[PDB]
């Protein structure tokens, strides 16, 4: 596997390029080379938006998944529609745990009370240009309690809940109808683990 | 009829591009990549339209990604290099990744994927098949990455690794491979490798 550590990097500076809702910084740095010595000075524009907790709501009794739908305008230029089917998710504030945030966002974004959880994976969304990390859990839910329109009018959020079979959700990944990283990763994980997960949660 | 709506089995998204009006896009920053402000209004689930909304969107183009798989040997090729943006949330910013590159003006996913396999990993690719195409993080960036699996014989400052498929997937499970493109590609491979090995060794 890997070889080097943070001691093998010199971050010379992080220079603010843009500050608004999100931020962009120019990282200026040097790093050790595989064949020895230090690199020249490298610069990269890095999009900074904090980090997220993500929850796949799975009903192991019914073999159903709860998805949320809302507009993500950034999807527009490359997608059939900017309304996407997604996992519940939210930012992790200072000092918070993934599990606390995941449970809260499930309740706030989709009205869901989560029972047990298990970790899926924690991933870097696109580390060539953004620092964002997202940590995914699967959360036990009763999919008869998933309903209604959600979102804070204070943040111009408008969210619909969809309850589908696991099989349908995964088929939608295969077909490209679900095609955002968090949901693809979560639903592929679920396809690899659902048998044992249902056993664990219906014992 | 609106009072006898009877499409029970129909599931999926609710609205189309005709249900949103993009009023303007204003560039907030443009260096190499850019940040645009999209100003728009959109239909609401309970009826009507929102007022004008603005969102900041990180614009960095789109990528082609290639999972290099040797179906004869059941091996995967990984490329290792520093990704400084990983620094704040990772023990090391050197990541194990799939080959990938930007799709430039007028280019196709397959051409870019094959080119990057040669330039980034020194690999000549045989057959390719699509894996999946995904939005990296659509709440803040437009970036789409389109993954192919490419048939290889496994025999920037980059180190090329050749590992068993089993080892690569174990590294996903353990968190040693933890970037979206590689996680998605290797999960896909775990779900499809029996069929892919049969298809490519026939
Ligand atoms: Na949320
Ligand atoms: Na590349």
Q: How many helices of chain A in DSSP terms? A: 3
Radius of gyration of chain A: 19 Å
Structural class of chain A: alpha+beta
Catalogue the ligands.
sodium ion
Oligomer: homodimer
What distance separates the N and C termini of chain A? 38 Å
Give the biggest sheet of chain A: 8 strands, mixed
- Please name the fourth-level CATH homologous superfamily of the largest domain in chain A: Nucleoside Triphosphate Pyrophosphohydrolase
- β-sheet strand percentage of chain A: 35-45%
Shape descriptor of chain A reads globular
Q: How many domains make up the 3D coordinates of chain A? A: 2
Summarize the helix and strand pattern of chain A as letters.
EEEEEEEHEEEEHH
Q: Would you give an account of this structure?
A:
The structure is a homodimer. The first copy, chain A, has 203 residues and is of the alpha+beta class. Chain A has helices spanning 98-110, 166-175, 181-202; strands at 9-19, 23-31, 42-48, 52-59, 64-71, 83-86, 88-91, 117-124, 133-140, 149-150, 159-165. In chain A, strand 10 (149-150) and strand 11 (159-165) form a beta hairpin. At the A-B interface, strand 1, strand 2, strand 3, strand 6 and strand 8 of A face strand 1, strand 2, strand 3, strand 6 and strand 8 of B. One sodium ion is lined by residues 88-90, 105, 109 of chain A. The PDB classes it as hydrolase. Keywords: ssgcid, structural genomics, seattle structural genomics center for infectious disease, ADP-ribose diphosphatase, hydrolase. The assembly is dimeric. Crystal structure of ADP-ribose diphosphatase from Klebsiella pneumoniae (Apo).
């Amino acid at each position: 596997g890997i070889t080097f550590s943070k001691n093998d990097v010199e971050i010379i500076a992080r220079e603010t390029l843009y500050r608004g809702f999100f931020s962009l910084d120019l990282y200026r740095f040097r790093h050790r080379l595989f064949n020895g010595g230090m690199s020249g000075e490298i610069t990269r524009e890095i999009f900074e938006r904090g980090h997220a907790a993500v929850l796949l709501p799975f009903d192991p009794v019914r073999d159903e998944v709860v998805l949320v739908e809302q507009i993500r305008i950034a999807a527009y230029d490359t997608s059939e529609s900017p309304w996407l089917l997604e996992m519940v998710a939210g930012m992790i504030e200072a000092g918070e745990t993934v599990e606390d945030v995941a449970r809260r966002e499930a309740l706030e974004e989709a009205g869901l009370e989560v029972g047990r959880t298990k970790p899926i994976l924690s991933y870097l969304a696109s580390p060539g240009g953004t620092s964002e990390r997202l940590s995914i859990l699967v959360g036990e839910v009763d999919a008869s309690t998933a309903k209604g329109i959600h979102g804070l009018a204070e943040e111009n959020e408008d969210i619909r809940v969809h309850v589908v079979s696991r099989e349908q959700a995964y088929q939608w990944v295969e077909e490209g109808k679900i095609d955002n990283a968090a949901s693809v990763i979560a639903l592929q994980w679920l396809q690899l683990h659902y048998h044992n997960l249902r056993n664990e949660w219906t014992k």
